[PDB]
Amino acid sequence: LALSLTADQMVSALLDAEPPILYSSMMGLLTNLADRELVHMINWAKRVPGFVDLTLHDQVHLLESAWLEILMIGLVWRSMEHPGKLLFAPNLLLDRNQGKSVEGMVEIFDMLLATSSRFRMMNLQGEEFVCLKSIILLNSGVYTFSTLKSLEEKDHIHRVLDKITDTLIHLMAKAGLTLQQQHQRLAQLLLILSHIRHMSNKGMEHLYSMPLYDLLLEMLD
Amino acid sequence: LALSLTADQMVSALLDAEPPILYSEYDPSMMGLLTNLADRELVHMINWAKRVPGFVDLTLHDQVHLLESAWLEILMIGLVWRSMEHPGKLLFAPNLLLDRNQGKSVEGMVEIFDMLLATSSRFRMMNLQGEEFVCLKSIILLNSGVYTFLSSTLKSLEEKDHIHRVLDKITDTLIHLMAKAGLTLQQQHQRLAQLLLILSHIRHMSNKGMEHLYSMVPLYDLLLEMLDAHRL
Numbered sequence: 001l002a003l004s005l006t007a008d009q010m011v012s013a014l015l016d017a018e019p020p021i022l023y024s025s026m027m028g029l030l031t032n033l034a035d036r037e038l039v040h041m042i043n044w045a046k047r048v049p050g051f052v053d054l055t056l057h058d059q060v061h062l063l064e065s066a067w068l069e070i071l072m073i074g075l076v077w078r079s080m081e082h083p084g085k086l087l088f089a090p091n092l093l094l095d096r097n098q099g100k101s102v103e104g105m106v107e108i109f110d111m112l113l114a115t116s117s118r119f120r121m122m123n124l125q126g127e128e129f130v131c132l133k134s135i136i137l138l139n140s141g142v143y144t145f146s147t148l149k150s151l152e153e154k155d156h157i158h159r160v161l162d163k164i165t166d167t168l169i170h171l172m173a174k175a176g177l178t179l180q181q182q183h184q185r186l187a188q189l190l191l192i193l194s195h196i197r198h199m200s201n202k203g204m205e206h207l208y209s210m211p212l213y214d215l216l217l218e219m220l221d
Numbered sequence: 222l223a224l225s226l227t228a229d230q231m232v233s234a235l236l237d238a239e240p241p242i243l244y245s246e247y248d249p250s251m252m253g254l255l256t257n258l259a260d261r262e263l264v265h266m267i268n269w270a271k272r273v274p275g276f277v278d279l280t281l282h283d284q285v286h287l288l289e290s291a292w293l294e295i296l297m298i299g300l301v302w303r304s305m306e307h308p309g310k311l312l313f314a315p316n317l318l319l320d321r322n323q324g325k326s327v328e329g330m331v332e333i334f335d336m337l338l339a340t341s342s343r344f345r346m347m348n349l350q351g352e353e354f355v356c357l358k359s360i361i362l363l364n365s366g367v368y369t370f371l372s373s374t375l376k377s378l379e380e381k382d383h384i385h386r387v388l389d390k391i392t393d394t395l396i397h398l399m400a401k402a403g404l405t406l407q408q409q410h411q412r413l414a415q416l417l418l419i420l421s422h423i424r425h426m427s428n429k430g431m432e433h434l435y436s437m438v439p440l441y442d443l444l445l446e447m448l449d450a451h452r453l
């Protein structure tokens with residue numbers, strides 16, 4: 001059970017669950033990439049402690065709400081060592097000028113780059129990244145689930161979320177930050193999740209300007 | 222100087238800065254009432270923003286960018302605060318208390334109405350304190366538009382560093398309140414996380430709100446006009 005994992009077991013479990021880096025006119029290639037990444041995201045999600053404990057429909061609701069944020073935080077994480085570029089795939093590395101080549105995408109491209117720089121600046125660690133990605137999955141769809149079962153599901157989510165918060169703090173203490181630094185960095189990282197939400201919402205409007213439930217359900221069952 | 226404030230003075234300053242609760246303005250359509258209401262609160266939001274420690278130290282341009290990004294999240298978080306004691310209802314104004322049946326009559330509104338309601342539920346179940354609320358509303362102002370700053374110039378980096386120091390101060394202030402309420406360190410870090418994850422929902426509701434309102438002078442120029450006082 002997720003609730004009885006230590007901090008180290010949480011980290012280890014999330015690190016093990018990491019999906020592969022996939023390989024790649026542009027929207028064709030990006031779409032093809034993302035669609036293939038989704039199949040592995042579902043697999044990753046089944047390994048996030050606590051996630052399989054939820055009902056199938058709740059599982060679907062969470063992925064339905066979080067999938068683009070998850071693709072974007074992975075994007076932003078793999079683009080950290082490539083200032084001014086987004087590493088969509090090891091063979092698809094794109095600059096803002098290439099992003100301009102698509103109607104509607106420069107502004108989000110620009111948001112994506114800036115997030116990547118911010119991760120670089122904070123020197124985001126891999127262990128921290130996997131916690132953040134897990135928080136997105138469990139948090140993004142949660143408030144948009146009055147029934148008896150919903151009470152139970154929400155309670156479980158907020159206990160797993162609390163476990164992940166403990167894990168982030170443990171990581172920051174091991175690294176030798178002061179208590180004050182720990183809370184400050186925790187806060188810094190969580191506020192970044194709000195930008196990621198923002199990019200995802202703008203991403204979706206952009207994608208829709210050119211049903212997923214059934215598809216996740218098939219993949220999840 | 223905002224960076225020299227203690228947690229208690231930070232809190233006192235934020236409580237003092239609180240805007241008033243405005244009334245809806247009508248003889249006793251719904252979107253007209255809501256719009257007139259929101260437009261009048263905007264004026265007061267600018268006064269509040271100037272009173273948030275650290276905000277006026279920024280350039281006019283950055284002040285306007287932060288508010289252009291965050292105004293609707295600020296209207297929504299206030300609405301959610303004032304609706305906490307009215308389960309199933311949104312208290313837009315003491316004279317405009319709406320249930321979801323009434324939000325359904327405005328086309329496209331119900332989904333966001335429900336999200337606003339669930340946020341209010343969450344605040345109530347968490348026992349959100351007034352002091353936590355004002356700190357969260359400040360975080361929204363300073364954080365929402367922070368990663369959409371155009372410039373990478375020296376001035377810009379100074380500005381962003383100042384903003385991040387002020388956000389850090391608010392984090393210390395939140396943690397201090399939780400320590401004063403007797404939470405263990407673990408409970409403190411847990412509740413801070415729960416609070417900040419709610420902001421990501423507030424962001425989401427604002428985005429969906431903006432899409433809805435766009436389906437119903439440029440805002441940048443309006444805020445500019447308001448924050449740009451003369452001293453006559």
Ligand SMILES: O=C(c1ccc(OCCN2CCCC2)cc1)c1c(-c2ccc(O)cc2)sc2cc(O)ccc12
Pocket residue numbers: 027030031032033034035037038071072074075088104105108109202203204206207212
């Ligand atoms: O360009 C994309 C993308 C393209 C198609 C797409 O979905 C097509 C529908 N599919 C059917 C059901 C499931 C999805 C998703 C993302 C990407 C991004 C994007 C960046 C900027 C923006 O304006 C919008 C989208 S970020 C990103 C990251 C990755 O790792 C891969 C891909 C992209």
Ligand SMILES: O=C(c1ccc(OCCN2CCCC2)cc1)c1c(-c2ccc(O)cc2)sc2cc(O)ccc12
Pocket residue numbers: 252255256258259260262263296297299300313329330331333334429430431433434440443
């Ligand atoms: O209904 C509203 C609202 C109406 C107009 C509006 O702006 C009209 C344009 N003006 C030009 C210049 C700037 C704005 C903003 C909010 C509200 C909300 C809303 C809730 C659900 C939703 O689907 C969308 C909007 S939440 C909220 C909270 C408050 O205190 C007051 C008002 C509302």
